[PDB]
Curated annotation (Swiss-Prot), chains A, B, C:
Disulfide cross-links: 49-114, 62-94, 63-96, 68-78, 259-271, 301-365, 306-369, 323-359
Source domain of life: Viruses
Protein name: Spike glycoprotein E1
Lineage per the UniProt record: Viruses, Riboviria, Orthornavirae, Kitrinoviricota, Alsuviricetes
Description of post-translational modifications: N-glycosylated.
Purpose: Class II viral fusion protein. Fusion activity is inactive as long as E1 is bound to E2 in mature virion. After virus attachment to target cell via host VLDLR or LRP8/APOER2 and endocytosis, acidification of the endosome induces dissociation of E1/E2 heterodimer and concomitant trimerization of the E1 subunits. This E1 trimer is fusion active, and promotes release of viral nucleocapsid in cytoplasm after endosome and viral membrane fusion. Efficient fusion requires the presence of cholesterol and sphingolipid in the target membrane.
Stretches for region E1 fusion peptide loop: 84-101
Glycosylation sites: 139, 245
Shown segment, full-protein numbering: 807 to 1186 of 1245
Length: 369, 369, 369
């Protein structure tokens, strides 16, 4: 094993803990962080891009009556205009004095160039964590992809390795995150079914290959002038051509604590946070080297080769095999662990004398520086 | 390296500098001066020597008129004399009473013996420098002819060796230097086109095989006496036969600081002056013997054989190879540098204990003386 | 012378000196400066302009070995690349797995457009002087091109006119002057054989029709990518296309004291400086009008016609001929000199009364114013 030691969140840093048991030889505990990956609960709901106005051909007639009927399309604003084309010299070659009408329909479908470049609207929430922690506990060297939580246990080398929930619940992604090419921004997209021509959500869709649209691009039908058969309207300039200016905060460049961001999975890599409380049920079989076998005598220690950031650990014992050696102070960490009589290690300390260890034992050592 | 150490101008003196870097082994820097050569900007302009008067034959006539015409030769002073040879009993067997004239021409061409012995007038100026500095930095022994200036870099052994401009701008040659046989004097020769019979520049020429002369040897035509056809003139005795007395200052014997002088290139050899600031961009590859390989222990030192101007440097290390050893005081310089366990050197000091170283380480040582 | 009077350096200004001899008539001395010309010792050494990279065709092979050999060209950086084109689908249709190499050569020759537009590097030094001084001393009016120095004498009108060295040794050209089209700048060009890609001296040459080059335009060979047979390099943009901005100081516009500058001879014209000490050995024959011939009586003087900047000099003598008349005060200079009984001159003074013267014487015158 029952153990539990605090282990922070900083890659490339070898961690060393110590087992202070009575009887059995104090084991070595080396753990290294390779690369962290934090992926929140991604829930795809909407997508957007450019569009193309699909204005049909008017069905101008004579003294006959007309009233448009709605159906199931994108955008719906139809108005019957009366009084246009008062004569044959007007444009439509009409014979009526003042009883003429038009349908004037106008919708907007997804453009052809939208299939490739797009934007995926999502609502980032309850972020999950998974850190592949290196494991070393003797002669074995296993690397496992472990989920960071106090619910999912391990196995590795007949051991129950638990990641444990970090005390830092800080996510670099807020409530809503939309994708762009291969970047990640913090966007304040409008509510579904409450769109506005204020940009940032024109004719939004469910996915890449959808078939149900909804929108309000401030479209208004205008009464044409008597000259030539035309269909003049005052449309709002697409906001997607203007969003390439007010983009701003890219997040990828404003990475907090050297953190990172992924494209496809929208994950945060190499991001330092808090501490990971690891607990492992190390059995009797792992505590190799009982008090009945190893019996090291007097410990000696002297320093020689040392430069800015072998300690002569000559011992005398019976039969080579294993032999755990670890530091006991607050400074100067060794490089290797299990090295059998004429032991050979190395350190990297300032000038104070140390001890560690190796193992057990222790020592310390030394230184140188 | 970026290094730079001061190195004086005295041949046959081994120079030893020290690299005080953090980490890598402090390298050895041996540099020796072989022979210095200082050649100024030589600009050949004029040459001189003996000459031979070329007096032609007079064209004496009778009662006819005469007036000489100038051309393009050396020296030009012609005067028509009237009243000479008043009768047939005078000399030229003339029939005129008092209407007789002569041309009387006289020029001076370069002698036949001038082709070999000569004198070359030059205007010594902006002196250049070139000193072949010996280079040693390990197992290599290269000798290069390097120009002494902070503009022309080097190569030698993958290193950028710079000579650097000396702080002493003293030249043994002044403004004008003329050659004689195989000697070098400081002469005050007259201005080109302003010659005078005051010697030191009679009928000067451009080079050895020229064809355009200019001069003024104070030549004057005199009216001959009526007796025999002659052409008597009062010429100035050549100054080149008199300059073998007022030569004086030979410079070669009054050599400043044991300096020398050359004949053909007019160069100053073995001439001590100031200091040569050398700077070399020594790369990582040259700094052999990192802190990870050599690990010499306790240093011991004792003196034995020493006479007026081996130090037992027994060491214990792993594997022979290189091993830089250098002095650290102000007196007692070693003879050799890189010598591998039972090291064997030698010194030449008075009686104090020196250093150381070796290397690195250281020491010191010782011484012885 | 034996005379000598100080004469300054300002063109279009008539100079008037006075001979104060005992006995003979005091002569008039008029001297005018036409146009000054100062040409320093021009020593052509280097020239520059645009260039064209001459990258040859690669000699890609198979599993055969390769090592490039240097010769005698401009620029020399060749590197054998290995590991490129691992397959037939790579680019060169190779059959080798990982044993393939290339030569990759690249030099730089003088461009075709360099023949006309160029730049001539020179080292301006010991400036010479030559001023064509007008000469008047009676009935003669000779104009001679005389060198300004106390070494080269004259002749003019049976007189030994000496220019004399000016007390002002100020040259508008400093140590180095390079030509551009038809302008003259003060440039700080690098040392010969110590060129750098810092511009102002890329691939310099001896002259216009040379055949020996030297340079270092920071050229570096890069390992190509496996796709299509190419030779990609990172070259430094020529400094000669950028020097049309940092040109600055043109000198021609910043002419000191209304001075000038020439194109072909690099001369300074109409440039005022100091004083020119002229000395002339005027013989007895030039001092016309002895005390035995002219005998002018009582001098009378009255002023009439005078405007802002004839003085009735009625005399009575025997026989017209010459007659030198000159001013004796510090203001009011005459226009003419030798004018015979009813003399007629003219002046240009303020309001003060003068004598113153014329011559011688015276016165014064016046015034016015």
């Amino acid at each position: 094993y029952e153990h539990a030691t605090t282990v922070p969140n900083v890659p490339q840093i070898p961690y060393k803990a110590l087992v202070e048991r009575a009887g059995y030889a104090p084991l070595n505990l080396e753990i290294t962080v390779m690369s962290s990956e934090v992926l929140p609960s991604t829930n795809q709901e909407y997508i957007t891009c450019k569009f193309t106005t699909v204005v049909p051909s008017p069905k101008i007639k004579c003294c006959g009556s007309l009233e448009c009927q709605p159906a199931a399309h994108a955008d719906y604003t139809c108005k019957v205009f009366g009084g246009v084309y008062p004569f044959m010299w007007g444009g439509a070659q009409c014979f009526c004095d003042s009883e003429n009408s038009q349908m004037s329909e106008a919708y907007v479908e997804l453009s052809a160039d939208c299939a490739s470049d797009h934007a995926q609207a999502i609502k980032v929430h309850t972020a999950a964590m998974k850190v592949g922690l290196r494991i070393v506990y003797g002669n074995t060297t296993s690397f496992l992809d472990v989920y960071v939580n106090g619910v999912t246990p391990g196995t590795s080398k007949d051991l129950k390795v638990i990641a444990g929930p970090i005390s830092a619940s800080f996510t670099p992604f807020d409530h809503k995150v939309v994708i762009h090419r291969g970047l990640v921004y913090n966007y304040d997209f409008p509510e579904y079914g409450a769109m506005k021509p204020g940009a940032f959500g024109d004719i939004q869709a469910t996915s890449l290959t959808s078939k149900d649209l909804i929108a309000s691009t401030d479209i208004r039908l205008l009464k044409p002038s008597a000259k030539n058969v035309h269909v003049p309207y005052t449309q709002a300039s697409s906001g997607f051509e203007m969003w390439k200016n007010n983009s701003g905060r890219p997040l990828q460049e404003t990475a907090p604590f050297g953190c990172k961001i992924a494209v496809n999975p929208l994950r945060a890599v190499d991001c330092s946070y808090g501490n990971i409380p690891i607990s492992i049920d190390i059995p009797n079989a792992a505590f190799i080297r009982t008090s009945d076998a190893p019996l090291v005598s007097t410990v000696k220690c002297e320093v020689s080769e040392c430069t800015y950031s072998m300690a002569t650990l000559q011992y005398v014992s019976d039969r080579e095999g294993q032999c755990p050696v670890h530091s006991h102070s607050s400074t100067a960490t060794l490089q290797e662990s299990t090295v059998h009589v004429t032991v050979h290690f190395s350190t990297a300390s300032p000038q104070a004398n140390f001890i560690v260890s190796l193992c057990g034992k222790k020592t310390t050592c030394n230184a140188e520086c």
